[PDB]
């Protein structure tokens, strides 16, 4: 979210209405994941020796 271009002129009289003010909603930003894998093989016959 952000602000609506703030200004330095906020000087109101002593007692008045609201003028409905002003607001700004949020913004959504999405991302997708990624899948990366590594594979390997080994023969179990390499254990008898040292």
């Amino acid at each position: 979210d952000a602000l609506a271009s703030v200004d330095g002129n906020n000087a109101h009289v002593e007692g008045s209405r609201a003028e409905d003010g002003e607001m700004k909603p949020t913004v959504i930003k999405s991302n997708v994941t990624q899948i990366l894998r590594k594979v390997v093989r080994v023969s179990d016959t390499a254990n008898t020796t040292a």
Partner: protein, 47 residues
């Protein structure tokens, strides 16, 4: 000595497929002490 390296073991089976096939693996070797201790005797026909 009946040298043994890997005892019979199985891999990761049961991927809910065409499994239920088993196997028996064995890694074995032979060794002799002091070759000039035992003896072999062949069969002879002529000369």
């Amino acid at each position: 000595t009946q040298m043994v390296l890997r005892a019979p073991k199985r891999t990761e089976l049961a991927k809910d497929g065409s499994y239920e096939k088993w196997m028996i693996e064995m890694e074995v070797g032979l060794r002799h002490r002091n070759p000039y201790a035992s003896g072999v005797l062949f069969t002879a026909a002529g000369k």
